[PDB]
């Protein structure tokens, strides 16, 4: 047993708050915001040795990242940003920092009760997205 066991599985989005405003702050344009804001993704998390894989799948976009904690990687986000990402575990929370064009956003993923809560922050704007097991 290990690091991220409680994150592993298949998760479905059940609620969202403030995601449009978060996307505005990130620089997402109108049409992408509308279509992405409609998405109801599933998030599929798996671990094999030191490698964590997170897939996001929706009618908008299917993405997949694989990474080792603490080890930077380049990521193309669903909204087509080219970012440099580092994901760490901080007191049981997965903390994902994305850097691009002098900007930064942080995505935190945590287990709370039977939920996986995703908090996305870009400057003063936070969006909270709640997932439940599929
Ligand atoms: S929690 C969650 N992760 N990833 C996506 C795709 C996405 C990422 C960044 C900006 C726009 C859309 C969604 S819709 N929800």
UniProtKB/Swiss-Prot annotation:
Transmembrane segments: none
This protein's GO CC annotations: cytoplasm; cytosol; extracellular exosome; lipid droplet; nucleus
UniProt GO MF annotations: fatty acid binding; hormone receptor binding; long-chain fatty acid binding; long-chain fatty acid transmembrane transporter activity
InterPro entries tied to this protein: Calycin, Fatty_acid-bd, ILBP, Lipocln_cytosolic_FA-bd_dom
The keyword Membrane is assigned to this record: no
GO biological process terms held by the UniProt record: brown fat cell differentiation; cellular response to lithium ion; cellular response to tumor necrosis factor; cholesterol homeostasis; fatty acid transport; long-chain fatty acid transport; negative regulation of DNA-templated transcription; positive regulation of cold-induced thermogenesis
Keywords: Acetylation, Cytoplasm, Lipid-binding, Nucleus, Phosphoprotein, Transport
Domain statement: Forms a beta-barrel structure that accommodates hydrophobic ligands in its interior.
Name of the protein: Fatty acid-binding protein, adipocyte
Protein species of origin: Homo sapiens
Native organism taxonomy: Eukaryota, Metazoa, Chordata, Craniata, Vertebrata
